[PDB]
Design a protein around this ligand. Sequence first.
Ligand SMILES: *[C@@H]1O[C@H](CO[C@@H]2O[C@@H](C)[C@@H](O)[C@@H](O)[C@@H]2O)[C@@H](O[C@@H]2O[C@H](CO)[C@@H](O)[C@H](O)[C@H]2NC(C)=O)[C@H](O[C@@H]2O[C@@H](C)[C@@H](O)[C@@H](O)[C@@H]2O)[C@H]1NC(C)=O
Ligand SMILES: *[C@@H]1O[C@H](CO[C@@H]2O[C@@H](C)[C@@H](O)[C@@H](O)[C@@H]2O)[C@@H](O[C@@H]2O[C@H](CO)[C@@H](O)[C@H](O)[C@H]2NC(C)=O)[C@H](O[C@@H]2O[C@@H](C)[C@@H](O)[C@@H](O)[C@@H]2O)[C@H]1NC(C)=O
Ligand SMILES: *[C@@H]1O[C@H](CO[C@@H]2O[C@@H](C)[C@@H](O)[C@@H](O)[C@@H]2O)[C@@H](O[C@@H]2O[C@H](CO)[C@@H](O)[C@H](O)[C@H]2NC(C)=O)[C@H](O[C@@H]2O[C@@H](C)[C@@H](O)[C@@H](O)[C@@H]2O)[C@H]1NC(C)=O
Lengths: 425, 425, 425
Amino acid sequence: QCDELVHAESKSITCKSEKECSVTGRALLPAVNPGQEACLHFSMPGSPDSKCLKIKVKSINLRCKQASSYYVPEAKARCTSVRRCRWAGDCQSGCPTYFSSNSFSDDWANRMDRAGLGMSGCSDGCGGAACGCFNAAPSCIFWRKWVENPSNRVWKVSPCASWVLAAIIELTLPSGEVKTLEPVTGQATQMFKGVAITYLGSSIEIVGMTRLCEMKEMGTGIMALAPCNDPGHAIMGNVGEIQCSSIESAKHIRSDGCIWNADLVGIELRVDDAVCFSKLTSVEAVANFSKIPAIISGVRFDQGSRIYGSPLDITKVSGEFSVSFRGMRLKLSEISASCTGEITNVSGCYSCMTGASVSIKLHSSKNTTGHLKCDSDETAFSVMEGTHTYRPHMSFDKAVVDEECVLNCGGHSSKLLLKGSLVFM
Amino acid sequence: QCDELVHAESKSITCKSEKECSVTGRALLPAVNPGQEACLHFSMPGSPDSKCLKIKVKSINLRCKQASSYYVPEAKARCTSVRRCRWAGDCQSGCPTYFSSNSFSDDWANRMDRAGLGMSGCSDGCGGAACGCFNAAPSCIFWRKWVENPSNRVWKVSPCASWVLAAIIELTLPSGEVKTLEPVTGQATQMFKGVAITYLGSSIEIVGMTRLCEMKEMGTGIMALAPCNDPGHAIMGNVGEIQCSSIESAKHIRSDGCIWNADLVGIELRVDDAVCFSKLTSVEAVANFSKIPAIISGVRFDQGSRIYGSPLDITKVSGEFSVSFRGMRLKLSEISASCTGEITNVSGCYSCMTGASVSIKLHSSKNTTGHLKCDSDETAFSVMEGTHTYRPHMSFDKAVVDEECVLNCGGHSSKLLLKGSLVFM
Amino acid sequence: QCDELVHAESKSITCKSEKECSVTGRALLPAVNPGQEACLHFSMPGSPDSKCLKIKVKSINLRCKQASSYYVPEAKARCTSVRRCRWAGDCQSGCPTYFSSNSFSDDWANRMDRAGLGMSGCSDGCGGAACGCFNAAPSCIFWRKWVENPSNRVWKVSPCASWVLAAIIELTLPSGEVKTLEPVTGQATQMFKGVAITYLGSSIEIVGMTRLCEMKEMGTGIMALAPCNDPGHAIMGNVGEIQCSSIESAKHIRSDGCIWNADLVGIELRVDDAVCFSKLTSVEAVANFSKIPAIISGVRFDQGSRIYGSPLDITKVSGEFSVSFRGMRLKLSEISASCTGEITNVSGCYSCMTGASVSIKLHSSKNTTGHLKCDSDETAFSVMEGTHTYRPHMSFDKAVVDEECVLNCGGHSSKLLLKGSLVFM
Ligand SMILES: *[C@@H]1O[C@H](CO[C@@H]2O[C@@H](C)[C@@H](O)[C@@H](O)[C@@H]2O)[C@@H](O[C@@H]2O[C@H](CO)[C@@H](O)[C@H](O)[C@H]2NC(C)=O)[C@H](O[C@@H]2O[C@@H](C)[C@@H](O)[C@@H](O)[C@@H]2O)[C@H]1NC(C)=O
Ligand SMILES: *[C@@H]1O[C@H](CO[C@@H]2O[C@@H](C)[C@@H](O)[C@@H](O)[C@@H]2O)[C@@H](O[C@@H]2O[C@H](CO)[C@@H](O)[C@H](O)[C@H]2NC(C)=O)[C@H](O[C@@H]2O[C@@H](C)[C@@H](O)[C@@H](O)[C@@H]2O)[C@H]1NC(C)=O
Ligand SMILES: *[C@@H]1O[C@H](CO[C@@H]2O[C@@H](C)[C@@H](O)[C@@H](O)[C@@H]2O)[C@@H](O[C@@H]2O[C@H](CO)[C@@H](O)[C@H](O)[C@H]2NC(C)=O)[C@H](O[C@@H]2O[C@@H](C)[C@@H](O)[C@@H](O)[C@@H]2O)[C@H]1NC(C)=O
């Protein structure tokens, strides 16, 4: 493959603890993008020459570092009321003073788990013969609005407080052994006689991503990745507008284990009934729409029960290596790529998080990186030797695509035309 | 200009595919801040010496990577009601069972686009002669609260799911040709005989920026950058508390194309009228306050119809280059700057996103970077040769500014005094 | 200490302004993690050899770059009402038209700061003898719901719009002088005869952190770090659901200096009283739970009255240096560490922002970096020579810990067993 990646080569004197000093060769690879691979040939002065040491970055991924978790139900709004004339039942003298948001009337008809999350009260109703009462003073309306979880469906929700880079590299030793591993950052690792490699860290050009949260439906394990509320903040209109501290608490939305804002349910008292209004957000609908694998604005998120993100523009992440070699000379194998191509389609949505699909047929003499810069967006992707079609996603702002793009594949540049039609949503 | 920027210079043997091996000179520039420029002199063994290759970073900017878009109206709250005695009109037997949140009474007086977003209902009202009715049973109050867009003003809102770095570099070839371009990351670009340059990527020291969204007023194109709701989440108190899927849907806030939380409008039924309460957030007021260009906490945001951010502290972003040279010797031109200065003013706000303005008159023998570290904040900016006044922004926490600051300009350090007075908001 | 950190060493020709050209030695340290230290020995051709120049990264921290600030009260909900028969008091002809959300009834009993934030109104009540009135037409209910701050407790809230890296380095000159400083990024600093050092910047592998806000209780100075609302957006369920523009405005929640959503307080009118509902979020409770120092998902936040964050995985931040040396030879002192250890405990919470505590006893021949990779999480920490116990935090997803972990300490790897039990919350 033989990418040009070694950008410094040095000979330093290194000493242990009199003193024991010797010459160390060192080769610095400041920036290696996913898919790229270097080929390093070591020969001792006596020689011949080894097959090369190959150093490839397979991927540099984003791992979710979680905030505290909580559980959410698929909640449904319910309301009930019963009216008692003054001097009847509890209404001996108007609304009884104790009857408050945790109170339950025995006169109630509907589903009343007395342990469920909700809000009760009692209100004045009309009295007199006109409203079916002997006593003309106001009647009592004992009412409750609450939420239940009839489907027993529950999601564990874990906000991603940040994402952390995690590299996977692939090394081919001159013996031919292939090693695929997450390296230990900053620790020189002896690979074979006289040669050690240090992974010096990963870097990313993507700043301040939007807050996303892992969702896992319990007892089905199916995952989603979507916005959610901070733990303990029951803000209406989001996953997490109801939050529970256990699976069972969420299954039955228990008052003692769940929080909410009671305005999620509206109740309208009428003389002889009540009208219920749901302002609830369907958790199920959000998870349906947000299933993994998903492309969200330049990053593909996928599941291993942990979620990781892969930047789609592979030139926006890189890893750095240092190679030391003792008593050996280094030669680099470096070759340019012959690569040409044409766009065969653009299709999809505009002003959408997925971005449109750009279909690009390329022929390439070796594995390399394709770059596509348009006026709306720009991206890069790995290209395989031979002739193949690639479908990177790119973001456009309008239904009509008709613009100049520049394709750069292995240093060869051409001005392609992108034309197509895209939908909203 | 001649900044010290080449921090490694090497001579490696590079080979193609027997084998064809030759010596490649390589120069690594690990970190170049905006405004900085290197000067590289190449001479062949026979010589004289070329004018230099100049490599300057013009800017490293943040480009908005959008989430899905939506449209928002400048919404205004409306309410209406009509009361019908029992046995009159629809109220033949109390509130009719069908009359619900999408129902419209023909008895209504006010603006009723039956396609608009809103919520209807009917409620019991007082009956009898005391409330103007023959029948003593409860009357019916048919009511609706809704939102309209009388100004027809609409903004397209595009949340920025993340920001991505984008570099602009300026190269001066020994021939004197100046090239200003966004380079292709990771691809060696042949510049002139024997010399190629690779841009190895950009890096930024600013972590996890606050969520901002592009706003564009339709039919005026004027832009703003401000917080907003995630698409599909109609959280009250934010741009995006009402969201529409098209311009026309937003112009007339259509029920079929818009979402909201109906608690954005309050209605109070009285016997013979209703009181309307608006809890709406003015979109216009947010966009007014959030016009581009804007400084938001260390980053200047500006328009090209796309928005980009420029870190104001120019030492917090950098680009990395590698230069290869074949059959040539390299010499670096590097000069230090003579530079002194004094603070002439500090004015503005404290505890504000803009930060205060610090006025600094500097004299400098060459283009260089000024650094100002204070106890409250710290920044750096590009400085031009000659005598000029600069106005970097810095953040303070109190109305009274009276503190030690250190000014570093081209390696020369001095302890300046910052004194001034600032306002809240 | 003698870490392997110099990964390039070069000899370039550098020229001033005929021309004055000379040879400059340069040593590049691409990536130095906190706790690591290099030892550089300079000898002039005549020699002996200096004690070394030591270059250590003490810390690379995250500094909060603030949005605009605001003040929040510890708010408490209040309600009052008074009912006047028709033809009595203001109720001469029903609810008076002027009586609206800023109106105050002189008939009111409760705490009425007429300058406080709140919402008034008047509503129809029942008339006639049945409701204590001679006139049978509807009575008037004059009511108000508002918020007060009885404790006078106020927090200044400053959202962190982003976090910026700030490095502290420690240099030991051959003379033995120790210098601890924040370096000036990108400026070559002359250290001693012939030697200068450039700090080339900091880098971090943590992307897009969750929005946090500094909180400072006024008149106590005690700090917290917690989510909050954007300035000017009074979204219910968060710190900042009530926002004030001054300390005094927050102390008494003045209408002219504070904003809110009036649905934070509910009022239910009954015939002869009103029921008050608080939907307020206790600011005090959030600050209590969010006190500094706090570990939030991989970062320890601590106070200097400014807050800074320290990444706990020290291999996820690094600094870069360049050293120039004039007329001298360089030798590197580099030694590997002997280091072994065992896990002695894991205790704490799962699916929590703190993460569990893993207790690790290590013996090490020198200061070095310990790395612990488990299936749930992975971290690294600084290790001191000798035998010591370390307690890095790691995130697990389940109450039962029983998994393979790999410990890497100075290049020595061992597969440890992690077993323990953790709680939710
Ligand atoms: C050339 O690239 C192939 C990989 O293509 C995949 O798509 C690329 C565009 C990019 O996305 C890359 O990340 C992908 O891996 C390599 O072959 C594949 O290697 C994977 C191992 O992960 C293996 O599962 C596939 O079967 C294999 N063949 C395919 C996809 O047709 C080539 O890798 C070399 O050749 C392979 C046969 C194997 O020996 C591998 O270890 C070698 O690196 C790439 N060519 C070269 C010369 O590297
Ligand atoms: C010295 O810097 C000038 C630029 O000043 C601007 O402000 C700086 C403090 C910093 O913000 C920088 O980003 C700005 O560009 C250069 O001159 C300007 O170059 C721009 C090109 O972008 C041009 O539009 C201006 O007319 C020009 N003159 C000004 C602003 O007075 C100097 O650049 C060199 O000289 C120019 C005449 C041009 O030949 C340019 O290509 C050269 O780089 C800077 N001096 C040197 C020696 O580089
Ligand atoms: C070995 O590390 C000691 C520091 O340990 C602390 O914990 C580490 C695991 C890591 O978290 C690190 O950041 C911490 O500083 C050093 O000694 C300490 O140095 C600090 C100065 O910040 C000082 O306050 C302590 O008293 C001191 N001794 C302790 C904690 O026992 C060693 O530093 C060297 O030796 C010191 C005596 C001092 O001369 C210092 O300047 C030296 O660097 C570290 N050893 C070596 C050889 O560097």
